[PDB]
Amino acid sequence: VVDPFTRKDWFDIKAPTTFENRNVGKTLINRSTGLKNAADGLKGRVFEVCLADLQGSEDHSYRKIKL
Amino acid sequence: MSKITSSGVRENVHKLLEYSTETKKRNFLETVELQVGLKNYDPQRDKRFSGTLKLPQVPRPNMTICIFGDAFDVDRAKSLGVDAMSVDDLKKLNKNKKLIKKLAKKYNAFIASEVLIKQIPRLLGPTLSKAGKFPTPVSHNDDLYSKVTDVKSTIKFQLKKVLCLAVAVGNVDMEEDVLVNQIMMAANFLVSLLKKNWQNVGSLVIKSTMGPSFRIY
RNA sequence: UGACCUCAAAUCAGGUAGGACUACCCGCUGAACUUAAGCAUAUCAAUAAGCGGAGGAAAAGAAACCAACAGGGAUUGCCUCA
RNA sequence: CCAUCGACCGAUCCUGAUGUGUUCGGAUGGAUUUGAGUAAGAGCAUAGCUGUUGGGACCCGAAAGAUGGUGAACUAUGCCUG
RNA sequence: UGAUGGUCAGAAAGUGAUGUUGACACAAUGUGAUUUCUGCCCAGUGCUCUGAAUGUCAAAGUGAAGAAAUUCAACCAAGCGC
RNA sequence: AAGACCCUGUUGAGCUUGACUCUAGUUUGACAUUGUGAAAAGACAUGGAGGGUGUAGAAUAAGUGGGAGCUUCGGCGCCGGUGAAAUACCACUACCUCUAUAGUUUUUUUACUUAUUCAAUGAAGCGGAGCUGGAGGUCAAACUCCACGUUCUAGCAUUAAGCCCUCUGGGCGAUCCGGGUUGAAGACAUUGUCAGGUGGGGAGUUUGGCUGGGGCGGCACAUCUGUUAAACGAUAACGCAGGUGU
RNA sequence: UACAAACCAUGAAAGUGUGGCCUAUCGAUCCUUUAGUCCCUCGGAAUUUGAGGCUAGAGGUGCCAGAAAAGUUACCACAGGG
Ligand SMILES: CC(=O)O[C@@H]1[C@@H](O)[C@H](O[C@H]2[C@H](OC(=O)[C@H]3CC[C@@H]4[C@H](C3)O[C@@]3(C[C@H](OC(=O)/C=C/c5ccccc5)[C@H](C)CO3)[C@]43CO3)O[C@H](C)[C@@H](O)[C@@H]2OC(C)=O)O[C@H](C)[C@H]1O
Ligand SMILES: [Mg+2]
Ligand SMILES: [Mg+2]
Ligand SMILES: [Mg+2]
Ligand SMILES: [Mg+2]
Ligand SMILES: [Mg+2]
Ligand SMILES: [Mg+2]
Ligand SMILES: [Mg+2]
Ligand SMILES: [Mg+2]
Ligand SMILES: [Mg+2]
Ligand SMILES: [Mg+2]
Ligand SMILES: [Mg+2]
Ligand SMILES: [Mg+2]
Ligand SMILES: [Mg+2]
Ligand SMILES: [Mg+2]
Ligand SMILES: [Mg+2]
Ligand SMILES: [Mg+2]
Ligand SMILES: [Mg+2]
Ligand SMILES: [Mg+2]
Ligand SMILES: [Mg+2]
Ligand SMILES: [Mg+2]
Ligand SMILES: [Mg+2]
Ligand SMILES: [Mg+2]
Ligand SMILES: [Mg+2]
Ligand SMILES: [Mg+2]
Ligand SMILES: [Mg+2]
Ligand SMILES: [Mg+2]
Ligand SMILES: [Mg+2]
Ligand SMILES: [Mg+2]
Ligand SMILES: [Mg+2]
Ligand SMILES: [Mg+2]
Ligand SMILES: [Mg+2]
Ligand SMILES: [Mg+2]
Ligand SMILES: [Mg+2]
Ligand SMILES: [Mg+2]
Ligand SMILES: [Mg+2]
Ligand SMILES: [Mg+2]
Ligand SMILES: [Mg+2]
Ligand SMILES: [Mg+2]
Ligand SMILES: [Mg+2]
Ligand SMILES: [Mg+2]
Ligand SMILES: [Mg+2]
Ligand SMILES: [Mg+2]
Ligand SMILES: [Mg+2]
Ligand SMILES: [Mg+2]
Ligand SMILES: [Mg+2]
Ligand SMILES: [Mg+2]
Ligand SMILES: [Mg+2]
Ligand SMILES: [Mg+2]
Ligand SMILES: [Mg+2]
Ligand SMILES: [Mg+2]
Ligand SMILES: [Mg+2]
Ligand SMILES: [Mg+2]
Ligand SMILES: [Mg+2]
Ligand SMILES: [Mg+2]
Ligand SMILES: [Mg+2]
Ligand SMILES: [Mg+2]
Ligand SMILES: [Mg+2]
Ligand SMILES: [Mg+2]
Ligand SMILES: [Mg+2]
Ligand SMILES: [Mg+2]
Ligand SMILES: [Mg+2]
Ligand SMILES: [Mg+2]
Ligand SMILES: [Mg+2]
Ligand SMILES: [Mg+2]
Ligand SMILES: [Mg+2]
Ligand SMILES: [Mg+2]
Ligand SMILES: [Mg+2]
Ligand SMILES: [Mg+2]
Ligand SMILES: [Mg+2]
Ligand SMILES: [Mg+2]
Ligand SMILES: [Mg+2]
Ligand SMILES: [Mg+2]
Ligand SMILES: [Mg+2]
Ligand SMILES: [Mg+2]
Ligand SMILES: [Mg+2]
Ligand SMILES: [Mg+2]
Ligand SMILES: [Mg+2]
Ligand SMILES: [Mg+2]
Ligand SMILES: [Mg+2]
Ligand SMILES: [Mg+2]
Ligand SMILES: [Mg+2]
């Protein structure tokens, strides 16, 4: 009735420099408004990504990292 | 309560007489154009109004005139009377958008005689007349020079589609107080024409071709 | 080292209030029996009882009055209005 | 003074002249309507008996209601001290 | 009922009881030693719990019309309803 | 002993309950007590300045009352031709917009403390800053943080020793500054006045009649037909057979 | 029920019709509301709202000449009554 996806803004996820492939992927959140900033409701999110992706090698396929 | 302040308009026509005798100007007398504000009304929604009485003294000190026709016309404004006409285009024209449009934009007033009942909504009609023309009720056994000199005093005050209408008349030749209340003897229509009458006023301005406004209503 | 303002103390100097009476007087507060042939609004009554405050009188009083007249002219009381 | 038929005044309804702030005026003539009326005044005042109403109301009589006060020397319960 | 409290008091108070108290406590009820047990019913009347949307819904407030008094309408707390 | 049972009285009282009418209390709202900031959706008002048609005028009107180079100049020029309405225009008004000043303005959030509210203390050490160490790892130069005299023992701790300047006194010892006693709470509570709800806890009152006692029943309580009714009319009973509120 | 003054219906007309073929089928003061007259008043003088009057209906009292009304007393009271 409203399509809540028109008010979503996409953000880029950056991993720390200890890993190699720091471009983890993309996430989204409700667009920043007057009452609520998008930033504060966005901090604290946890992403679980496989270590083989963060290092390129498939030898780390069995470990998964929470960022 | 009626926002009439004649003593206010006294010192104001003097301040008008300032930039028309004191202060600065060309040298002398011009067109008095004191204004109002006009609120508490509605250009649409309601209806229309009109009010014309021939104001106390002489407004237009150089009125422009174009006496239509010849029949019973001209023959009453020859010699001592100027203007008149020589028909001519009353049989031609009537196809030329101009000439009559020129006559309307040139001179300031025509007449109505007793034969003009044809020309105004026949030879003109949608062509002119209703576009903003007012035939002058003049015939034979009438006041003549008196009622057509009173045409200079024949003001208007009709309604259109704007909350402006702050027009004025007269000239600065008037004595210290010849205006003042003479303009107030024009506010009477403007009052009765509006809905709540004396209430539908937003502001008031004393001014001419020479002034701005000197703190009025 | 002295003014001012505000606030205190004294067995300071000198004063003043309280309490009483009940018939009348100025206020507050305030019932019910009763009448209504029942009864609640109403009446008894702006009364009894309760409280504060006076005097020889008290109170009121020299119009933010009455009027609607051809106008009267502080207050109070009697007769009348009724 | 009695019965009866009328007249007059007010209200109600009907008619509606000359006239006119053209909506006022209301002449004239009527109506099983109506008034505690007019129609050559009868009242005012004092007193008395009888009768009426409000009053304690012929005298005495409740169970009740209200206001303001006095009691825990008996007795109920708590506390203190024996 | 965890004290900005429960239960209770006062006409009010810068007023009180529990309270020198704090859930092994205070306050309110029912039943009534021990033994053995206390079944089914929340539809009714109570008591209690949420209120995100929500019928009803006061004063004030809001909007409109009016010359205004005023009228009409929307919104509408708790409660009821659910 | 003026029946206490029974009945009557338009006599009560004690008690009860969604009987009638109210009420202390309490709850909910509004107004006042009530002040200072920030943000949000937005509305306004006020000061600016700026903005515009479909043709035609090549020329962007969006308004309606008028002449003349005003401003050295003369870019553009000032009614005459092109439009329904005119090319420096002005004297000013009138509308509207879409930019800006930091004006009041409604609703939601969270900051303040001085009103108000709670508490303690013989109003004792509050707030801020600085000395001293312990750390951060110093990467300029000391920014941040922590601590800043008492813990085997049922003792003792009271009216300054010591030092500096000479001034029977002044200072340090016992760091400076602000004189906010110190916390909590806070424009909400509370309190005042109305308004809606709740309110046998309490207040006041009522709770027909007839009647083979009263009660239950019935209505003979307002009524109609035929009869009892005894040949005018009238005539009673909780007499007889029935009816009416349509 | 019978007429008086209107306006109608019906019938050729005479006539008849003022509810039901007759004997039952209903409702005061106060308040409200509607209709009528478009009349009187708001009392210092006016206009327009509002209000109040005069006349006729409706809303109802069935205990029907017309209060607004639940129980209990074996804790009980009083005035009386054969
Ligand atoms: C509904 C309720 O339970 O109570 C109402 C009450 O609300 C009503 O109170 C009215 C009240 O009634 C009265 O004061 C009396 C008027 C006349 C008496 C009586 C009451 O009404 C009577 C009885 C009966 O008329 C009624 O009954 C009237 C109901 C009514 C309703 C609204 C307005 C006016 C009357 C007769 C025809 C003549 O009139 C009368 C002779 O007994 O008057 C006020 C002005 C009215 O606003 C008020 O109305 C309201 C809603 O409150 O009185 C009625 C009798 C009750 O039924
Ligand atoms: Mg002394
Ligand atoms: Mg002295
Ligand atoms: Mg005394
Ligand atoms: Mg008595
Ligand atoms: Mg009585
Ligand atoms: Mg009696
Ligand atoms: Mg009684
Ligand atoms: Mg009295
Ligand atoms: Mg009284
Ligand atoms: Mg009293
Ligand atoms: Mg007394
Ligand atoms: Mg006294
Ligand atoms: Mg004395
Ligand atoms: Mg004397
Ligand atoms: Mg005196
Ligand atoms: Mg005086
Ligand atoms: Mg006098
Ligand atoms: Mg006197
Ligand atoms: Mg008399
Ligand atoms: Mg009469
Ligand atoms: Mg006439
Ligand atoms: Mg006459
Ligand atoms: Mg008579
Ligand atoms: Mg006589
Ligand atoms: Mg006589
Ligand atoms: Mg006696
Ligand atoms: Mg007597
Ligand atoms: Mg007597
Ligand atoms: Mg007695
Ligand atoms: Mg007694
Ligand atoms: Mg009593
Ligand atoms: Mg007492
Ligand atoms: Mg004792
Ligand atoms: Mg406790
Ligand atoms: Mg139990
Ligand atoms: Mg069981
Ligand atoms: Mg089963
Ligand atoms: Mg159940
Ligand atoms: Mg239940
Ligand atoms: Mg909702
Ligand atoms: Mg409301
Ligand atoms: Mg309003
Ligand atoms: Mg009114
Ligand atoms: Mg609600
Ligand atoms: Mg509920
Ligand atoms: Mg006896
Ligand atoms: Mg006895
Ligand atoms: Mg009796
Ligand atoms: Mg009683
Ligand atoms: Mg009783
Ligand atoms: Mg008793
Ligand atoms: Mg209480
Ligand atoms: Mg409150
Ligand atoms: Mg507030
Ligand atoms: Mg410190
Ligand atoms: Mg302290
Ligand atoms: Mg705080
Ligand atoms: Mg508050
Ligand atoms: Mg309050
Ligand atoms: Mg209090
Ligand atoms: Mg209340
Ligand atoms: Mg109760
Ligand atoms: Mg009771
Ligand atoms: Mg009864
Ligand atoms: Mg009986
Ligand atoms: Mg019976
Ligand atoms: Mg007989
Ligand atoms: Mg029978
Ligand atoms: Mg029937
Ligand atoms: Mg007839
Ligand atoms: Mg009736
Ligand atoms: Mg009646
Ligand atoms: Mg008056
Ligand atoms: Mg009058
Ligand atoms: Mg009359
Ligand atoms: Mg009766
Ligand atoms: Mg009877
Ligand atoms: Mg018993
Ligand atoms: Mg018994
Ligand atoms: Mg017992
Ligand atoms: Mg006997």
PDB file of all heavy atoms in Angstrom, chain G residues 40-48:
ATOM      1  P     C G  40     -50.260  45.325  17.266  1.00  0.00           P
ATOM      2  OP1   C G  40     -50.541  46.767  17.085  1.00  0.00           O
ATOM      3  OP2   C G  40     -49.055  44.724  16.640  1.00  0.00           O
ATOM      4  O5'   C G  40     -50.215  45.022  18.830  1.00  0.00           O
ATOM      5  C5'   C G  40     -51.224  45.524  19.696  1.00  0.00           C
ATOM      6  C4'   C G  40     -51.046  45.023  21.106  1.00  0.00           C
ATOM      7  O4'   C G  40     -51.262  43.588  21.131  1.00  0.00           O
ATOM      8  C3'   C G  40     -49.661  45.195  21.717  1.00  0.00           C
ATOM      9  O3'   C G  40     -49.423  46.494  22.230  1.00  0.00           O
ATOM     10  C2'   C G  40     -49.625  44.109  22.772  1.00  0.00           C
ATOM     11  O2'   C G  40     -50.341  44.498  23.931  1.00  0.00           O
ATOM     12  C1'   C G  40     -50.393  42.990  22.069  1.00  0.00           C
ATOM     13  N1    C G  40     -49.490  42.079  21.335  1.00  0.00           N
ATOM     14  C2    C G  40     -48.658  41.224  22.057  1.00  0.00           C
ATOM     15  O2    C G  40     -48.693  41.290  23.296  1.00  0.00           O
ATOM     16  N3    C G  40     -47.825  40.388  21.388  1.00  0.00           N
ATOM     17  C4    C G  40     -47.826  40.368  20.052  1.00  0.00           C
ATOM     18  N4    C G  40     -46.995  39.523  19.433  1.00  0.00           N
ATOM     19  C5    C G  40     -48.682  41.219  19.296  1.00  0.00           C
ATOM     20  C6    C G  40     -49.495  42.044  19.970  1.00  0.00           C
ATOM     21  P     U G  41     -47.962  47.152  22.118  1.00  0.00           P
ATOM     22  OP1   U G  41     -48.083  48.592  22.463  1.00  0.00           O
ATOM     23  OP2   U G  41     -47.371  46.735  20.818  1.00  0.00           O
ATOM     24  O5'   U G  41     -47.112  46.443  23.267  1.00  0.00           O
ATOM     25  C5'   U G  41     -47.483  46.573  24.634  1.00  0.00           C
ATOM     26  C4'   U G  41     -46.623  45.718  25.533  1.00  0.00           C
ATOM     27  O4'   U G  41     -46.863  44.317  25.244  1.00  0.00           O
ATOM     28  C3'   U G  41     -45.120  45.869  25.365  1.00  0.00           C
ATOM     29  O3'   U G  41     -44.595  47.007  26.023  1.00  0.00           O
ATOM     30  C2'   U G  41     -44.590  44.549  25.903  1.00  0.00           C
ATOM     31  O2'   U G  41     -44.570  44.543  27.319  1.00  0.00           O
ATOM     32  C1'   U G  41     -45.672  43.580  25.429  1.00  0.00           C
ATOM     33  N1    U G  41     -45.312  42.966  24.137  1.00  0.00           N
ATOM     34  C2    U G  41     -44.352  41.991  24.156  1.00  0.00           C
ATOM     35  O2    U G  41     -43.805  41.626  25.177  1.00  0.00           O
ATOM     36  N3    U G  41     -44.039  41.451  22.940  1.00  0.00           N
ATOM     37  C4    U G  41     -44.597  41.789  21.723  1.00  0.00           C
ATOM     38  O4    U G  41     -44.219  41.212  20.703  1.00  0.00           O
ATOM     39  C5    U G  41     -45.593  42.815  21.781  1.00  0.00           C
ATOM     40  C6    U G  41     -45.908  43.356  22.963  1.00  0.00           C
ATOM     41  P     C G  42     -43.298  47.756  25.446  1.00  0.00           P
ATOM     42  OP1   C G  42     -43.222  49.109  26.056  1.00  0.00           O
ATOM     43  OP2   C G  42     -43.329  47.612  23.967  1.00  0.00           O
ATOM     44  O5'   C G  42     -42.084  46.886  26.006  1.00  0.00           O
ATOM     45  C5'   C G  42     -41.906  46.698  27.405  1.00  0.00           C
ATOM     46  C4'   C G  42     -40.893  45.619  27.706  1.00  0.00           C
ATOM     47  O4'   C G  42     -41.333  44.359  27.155  1.00  0.00           O
ATOM     48  C3'   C G  42     -39.513  45.834  27.110  1.00  0.00           C
ATOM     49  O3'   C G  42     -38.739  46.663  27.943  1.00  0.00           O
ATOM     50  C2'   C G  42     -38.961  44.426  27.009  1.00  0.00           C
ATOM     51  O2'   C G  42     -38.443  44.020  28.263  1.00  0.00           O
ATOM     52  C1'   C G  42     -40.223  43.612  26.722  1.00  0.00           C
ATOM     53  N1    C G  42     -40.410  43.326  25.287  1.00  0.00           N
ATOM     54  C2    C G  42     -39.644  42.330  24.681  1.00  0.00           C
ATOM     55  O2    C G  42     -38.791  41.742  25.366  1.00  0.00           O
ATOM     56  N3    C G  42     -39.843  42.062  23.369  1.00  0.00           N
ATOM     57  C4    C G  42     -40.777  42.733  22.682  1.00  0.00           C
ATOM     58  N4    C G  42     -40.943  42.439  21.392  1.00  0.00           N
ATOM     59  C5    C G  42     -41.581  43.740  23.287  1.00  0.00           C
ATOM     60  C6    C G  42     -41.370  43.994  24.582  1.00  0.00           C
ATOM     61  P     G G  43     -38.446  48.167  27.501  1.00  0.00           P
ATOM     62  OP1   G G  43     -38.461  48.272  26.018  1.00  0.00           O
ATOM     63  OP2   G G  43     -37.273  48.660  28.267  1.00  0.00           O
ATOM     64  O5'   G G  43     -39.743  48.893  28.058  1.00  0.00           O
ATOM     65  C5'   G G  43     -39.748  50.278  28.311  1.00  0.00           C
ATOM     66  C4'   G G  43     -40.700  50.641  29.418  1.00  0.00           C
ATOM     67  O4'   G G  43     -41.870  49.790  29.358  1.00  0.00           O
ATOM     68  C3'   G G  43     -40.172  50.463  30.830  1.00  0.00           C
ATOM     69  O3'   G G  43     -39.484  51.614  31.232  1.00  0.00           O
ATOM     70  C2'   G G  43     -41.428  50.225  31.650  1.00  0.00           C
ATOM     71  O2'   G G  43     -42.044  51.460  31.982  1.00  0.00           O
ATOM     72  C1'   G G  43     -42.322  49.491  30.657  1.00  0.00           C
ATOM     73  N9    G G  43     -42.255  48.036  30.857  1.00  0.00           N
ATOM     74  C8    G G  43     -41.280  47.319  31.509  1.00  0.00           C
ATOM     75  N7    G G  43     -41.526  46.037  31.533  1.00  0.00           N
ATOM     76  C5    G G  43     -42.741  45.909  30.869  1.00  0.00           C
ATOM     77  C6    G G  43     -43.517  44.761  30.580  1.00  0.00           C
ATOM     78  O6    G G  43     -43.284  43.582  30.862  1.00  0.00           O
ATOM     79  N1    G G  43     -44.674  45.096  29.887  1.00  0.00           N
ATOM     80  C2    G G  43     -45.039  46.370  29.513  1.00  0.00           C
ATOM     81  N2    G G  43     -46.198  46.496  28.847  1.00  0.00           N
ATOM     82  N3    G G  43     -44.326  47.448  29.781  1.00  0.00           N
ATOM     83  C4    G G  43     -43.206  47.139  30.460  1.00  0.00           C
ATOM     84  P     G G  44     -37.891  51.659  31.130  1.00  0.00           P
ATOM     85  OP1   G G  44     -37.414  50.593  30.205  1.00  0.00           O
ATOM     86  OP2   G G  44     -37.396  51.701  32.533  1.00  0.00           O
ATOM     87  O5'   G G  44     -37.639  53.091  30.489  1.00  0.00           O
ATOM     88  C5'   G G  44     -38.586  54.129  30.681  1.00  0.00           C
ATOM     89  C4'   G G  44     -38.352  55.267  29.727  1.00  0.00           C
ATOM     90  O4'   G G  44     -36.976  55.691  29.857  1.00  0.00           O
ATOM     91  C3'   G G  44     -38.502  54.956  28.240  1.00  0.00           C
ATOM     92  O3'   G G  44     -39.843  55.006  27.791  1.00  0.00           O
ATOM     93  C2'   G G  44     -37.600  55.979  27.586  1.00  0.00           C
ATOM     94  O2'   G G  44     -38.250  57.237  27.518  1.00  0.00           O
ATOM     95  C1'   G G  44     -36.465  56.070  28.602  1.00  0.00           C
ATOM     96  N9    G G  44     -35.356  55.164  28.269  1.00  0.00           N
ATOM     97  C8    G G  44     -34.916  54.053  28.945  1.00  0.00           C
ATOM     98  N7    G G  44     -33.894  53.478  28.362  1.00  0.00           N
ATOM     99  C5    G G  44     -33.653  54.261  27.239  1.00  0.00           C
ATOM    100  C6    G G  44     -32.680  54.158  26.209  1.00  0.00           C
ATOM    101  O6    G G  44     -31.786  53.318  26.064  1.00  0.00           O
ATOM    102  N1    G G  44     -32.821  55.180  25.273  1.00  0.00           N
ATOM    103  C2    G G  44     -33.767  56.174  25.315  1.00  0.00           C
ATOM    104  N2    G G  44     -33.772  57.086  24.335  1.00  0.00           N
ATOM    105  N3    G G  44     -34.673  56.279  26.262  1.00  0.00           N
ATOM    106  C4    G G  44     -34.554  55.299  27.175  1.00  0.00           C
ATOM    107  P     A G  45     -40.317  54.102  26.550  1.00  0.00           P
ATOM    108  OP1   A G  45     -41.774  54.258  26.326  1.00  0.00           O
ATOM    109  OP2   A G  45     -39.736  52.753  26.689  1.00  0.00           O
ATOM    110  O5'   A G  45     -39.545  54.732  25.316  1.00  0.00           O
ATOM    111  C5'   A G  45     -39.928  56.003  24.813  1.00  0.00           C
ATOM    112  C4'   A G  45     -39.390  56.212  23.425  1.00  0.00           C
ATOM    113  O4'   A G  45     -37.971  56.498  23.457  1.00  0.00           O
ATOM    114  C3'   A G  45     -39.505  54.989  22.537  1.00  0.00           C
ATOM    115  O3'   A G  45     -40.801  54.866  21.992  1.00  0.00           O
ATOM    116  C2'   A G  45     -38.421  55.223  21.499  1.00  0.00           C
ATOM    117  O2'   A G  45     -38.883  56.120  20.502  1.00  0.00           O
ATOM    118  C1'   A G  45     -37.345  55.927  22.331  1.00  0.00           C
ATOM    119  N9    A G  45     -36.294  55.015  22.813  1.00  0.00           N
ATOM    120  C8    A G  45     -36.201  54.454  24.061  1.00  0.00           C
ATOM    121  N7    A G  45     -35.130  53.716  24.228  1.00  0.00           N
ATOM    122  C5    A G  45     -34.459  53.825  23.018  1.00  0.00           C
ATOM    123  C6    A G  45     -33.249  53.280  22.552  1.00  0.00           C
ATOM    124  N6    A G  45     -32.455  52.477  23.264  1.00  0.00           N
ATOM    125  N1    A G  45     -32.875  53.591  21.294  1.00  0.00           N
ATOM    126  C2    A G  45     -33.666  54.393  20.569  1.00  0.00           C
ATOM    127  N3    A G  45     -34.820  54.966  20.891  1.00  0.00           N
ATOM    128  C4    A G  45     -35.155  54.647  22.150  1.00  0.00           C
ATOM    129  P     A G  46     -41.254  53.496  21.303  1.00  0.00           P
ATOM    130  OP1   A G  46     -42.725  53.534  21.092  1.00  0.00           O
ATOM    131  OP2   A G  46     -40.660  52.402  22.117  1.00  0.00           O
ATOM    132  O5'   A G  46     -40.522  53.546  19.888  1.00  0.00           O
ATOM    133  C5'   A G  46     -40.074  52.359  19.255  1.00  0.00           C
ATOM    134  C4'   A G  46     -39.021  52.637  18.209  1.00  0.00           C
ATOM    135  O4'   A G  46     -37.822  53.162  18.830  1.00  0.00           O
ATOM    136  C3'   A G  46     -38.548  51.411  17.445  1.00  0.00           C
ATOM    137  O3'   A G  46     -39.424  51.102  16.378  1.00  0.00           O
ATOM    138  C2'   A G  46     -37.158  51.814  16.979  1.00  0.00           C
ATOM    139  O2'   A G  46     -37.233  52.605  15.806  1.00  0.00           O
ATOM    140  C1'   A G  46     -36.686  52.691  18.144  1.00  0.00           C
ATOM    141  N9    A G  46     -35.817  52.010  19.119  1.00  0.00           N
ATOM    142  C8    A G  46     -36.041  51.938  20.472  1.00  0.00           C
ATOM    143  N7    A G  46     -35.088  51.335  21.140  1.00  0.00           N
ATOM    144  C5    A G  46     -34.149  51.026  20.165  1.00  0.00           C
ATOM    145  C6    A G  46     -32.897  50.382  20.222  1.00  0.00           C
ATOM    146  N6    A G  46     -32.347  49.909  21.343  1.00  0.00           N
ATOM    147  N1    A G  46     -32.215  50.235  19.068  1.00  0.00           N
ATOM    148  C2    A G  46     -32.760  50.709  17.944  1.00  0.00           C
ATOM    149  N3    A G  46     -33.923  51.330  17.759  1.00  0.00           N
ATOM    150  C4    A G  46     -34.569  51.476  18.924  1.00  0.00           C
ATOM    151  P     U G  47     -39.909  49.601  16.117  1.00  0.00           P
ATOM    152  OP1   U G  47     -41.112  49.675  15.248  1.00  0.00           O
ATOM    153  OP2   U G  47     -39.987  48.908  17.428  1.00  0.00           O
ATOM    154  O5'   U G  47     -38.750  48.982  15.221  1.00  0.00           O
ATOM    155  C5'   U G  47     -38.430  49.540  13.957  1.00  0.00           C
ATOM    156  C4'   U G  47     -37.154  48.953  13.411  1.00  0.00           C
ATOM    157  O4'   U G  47     -36.020  49.409  14.191  1.00  0.00           O
ATOM    158  C3'   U G  47     -37.053  47.434  13.452  1.00  0.00           C
ATOM    159  O3'   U G  47     -37.695  46.820  12.352  1.00  0.00           O
ATOM    160  C2'   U G  47     -35.555  47.193  13.453  1.00  0.00           C
ATOM    161  O2'   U G  47     -35.036  47.281  12.135  1.00  0.00           O
ATOM    162  C1'   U G  47     -35.050  48.387  14.261  1.00  0.00           C
ATOM    163  N1    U G  47     -34.750  48.103  15.683  1.00  0.00           N
ATOM    164  C2    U G  47     -33.535  47.521  16.008  1.00  0.00           C
ATOM    165  O2    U G  47     -32.746  47.122  15.168  1.00  0.00           O
ATOM    166  N3    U G  47     -33.318  47.343  17.357  1.00  0.00           N
ATOM    167  C4    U G  47     -34.143  47.735  18.391  1.00  0.00           C
ATOM    168  O4    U G  47     -33.816  47.525  19.561  1.00  0.00           O
ATOM    169  C5    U G  47     -35.348  48.380  17.967  1.00  0.00           C
ATOM    170  C6    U G  47     -35.597  48.557  16.665  1.00  0.00           C
ATOM    171  P     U G  48     -38.604  45.523  12.574  1.00  0.00           P
ATOM    172  OP1   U G  48     -39.445  45.338  11.362  1.00  0.00           O
ATOM    173  OP2   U G  48     -39.231  45.629  13.917  1.00  0.00           O
ATOM    174  O5'   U G  48     -37.555  44.328  12.594  1.00  0.00           O
ATOM    175  C5'   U G  48     -36.674  44.115  11.505  1.00  0.00           C
ATOM    176  C4'   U G  48     -35.401  43.436  11.945  1.00  0.00           C
ATOM    177  O4'   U G  48     -34.709  44.248  12.928  1.00  0.00           O
ATOM    178  C3'   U G  48     -35.559  42.088  12.632  1.00  0.00           C
ATOM    179  O3'   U G  48     -35.766  41.042  11.703  1.00  0.00           O
ATOM    180  C2'   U G  48     -34.266  41.958  13.421  1.00  0.00           C
ATOM    181  O2'   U G  48     -33.205  41.534  12.577  1.00  0.00           O
ATOM    182  C1'   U G  48     -34.015  43.412  13.832  1.00  0.00           C
ATOM    183  N1    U G  48     -34.431  43.760  15.212  1.00  0.00           N
ATOM    184  C2    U G  48     -33.564  43.483  16.247  1.00  0.00           C
ATOM    185  O2    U G  48     -32.523  42.870  16.084  1.00  0.00           O
ATOM    186  N3    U G  48     -33.992  43.878  17.493  1.00  0.00           N
ATOM    187  C4    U G  48     -35.152  44.561  17.803  1.00  0.00           C
ATOM    188  O4    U G  48     -35.396  44.856  18.976  1.00  0.00           O
ATOM    189  C5    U G  48     -35.973  44.858  16.669  1.00  0.00           C
ATOM    190  C6    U G  48     -35.586  44.470  15.448  1.00  0.00           C
TER     191        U G  48
END
